[PDB]
């Protein structure tokens, strides 16, 4: 805290409490006994534990029929309307389009939509899988998920 | 009808004018005027000006015939005070309170 180490008043005889500096935590305008430091909150998670969790989440989604396997899911042109129409007829509003390979047309189409999110198999996290109401995979996406899970 | 009349930030202290307020509280305006006229305090003239204003508001903004008017509610409440530093002996310093008050006058016929 900006200031000086000067004692505001001598240490005896005064009819006031003993003070050492104006920067004391119990003094106005300067203090904070335990000031925060910039620290990282990242936690280690075992690879087997992380993989085991994904298997559990995938199993649960299948049981609760929140996971749907379909053939290739692509859009002829990079237009959001086409993606919106292709989902309305399917009656999907909060969906995660997990595709085997990232496609620019699909990526651009889903970028504006917030309830619709498109990702690759590599780019999957447990939080996103649970958060999204439905997940639709592709045959290739499922196959690559099988092998890398092992 | 209420015909209130306030004078805020009066020079005198709230206490000192309360003595004058008690003299005229509940009494008819006719006797109130002379009592304040012949009372030897500035609070007398300070309150008298407020009482005169209250009568004027009643006569002008409301029904006439000020003769049948009584001071129903007279009270004073201390207002903001000004802090002043005054030197004392041995180099010490004290704070002088230039106190003020708000005088409210309410006169009604009934």
């Amino acid at each position: 805290v900006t200031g000086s180490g000067k004692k505001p008043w001598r240490q005896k005889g005064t009819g006031r409490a003993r003070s050492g500096s104006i920067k004391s935590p119990i003094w106005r305008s300067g203090g904070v006994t335990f000031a925060a430091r910039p620290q990282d909150h990242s936690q280690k998670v075992n690879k087997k534990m992380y993989r085991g969790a994904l298997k559990s989440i995938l199993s649960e989604l299948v049981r609760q029929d929140r996971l749907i396997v379909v053939e290739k899911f692509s859009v002829e042109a990079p237009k959001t309307k086409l993606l919106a129409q292709k989902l309305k007829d399917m009656a999907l509003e909060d969906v995660l389009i997990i595709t085997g390979e990232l496609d620019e047309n699909l990526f651009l189409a889903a970028r504006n939509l917030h309830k619709v999110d498109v990702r690759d198999a590599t780019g999957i996290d447990p939080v996103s899988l649970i958060a999204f109401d439905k997940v639709v995979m592709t045959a290739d996406a499922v196959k690559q998920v099988e092998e890398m899970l092992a | 009808m209420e015909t209130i009349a306030k004078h805020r930030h009066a020079r005198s202290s709230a206490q000192k004018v309360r003595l004058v307020a008690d003299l005229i509280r509940g009494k008819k305006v006719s006797q109130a005027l002379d009592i304040l006229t012949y009372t030897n305090k500035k609070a007398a003239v300070l309150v008298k000006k407020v009482l005169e204003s209250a009568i004027a508001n009643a006569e002008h903004n409301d029904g006439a015939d000020i003769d049948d008017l009584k001071v129903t509610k007279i009270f004073v409440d201390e207002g903001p005070s000004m802090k002043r530093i005054m030197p004392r002996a041995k180099g010490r310093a004290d704070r002088i309170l230039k106190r003020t008050s708000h005088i409210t006058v309410v006169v009604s016929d009934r």
Partner: peptide, 17 residues
Amino acid sequence: NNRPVYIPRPRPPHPRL
């Protein structure tokens, strides 16, 4: 609203010795 800066030295006490 400055807090008193100069506090005088206390008056010497009566010798209780």
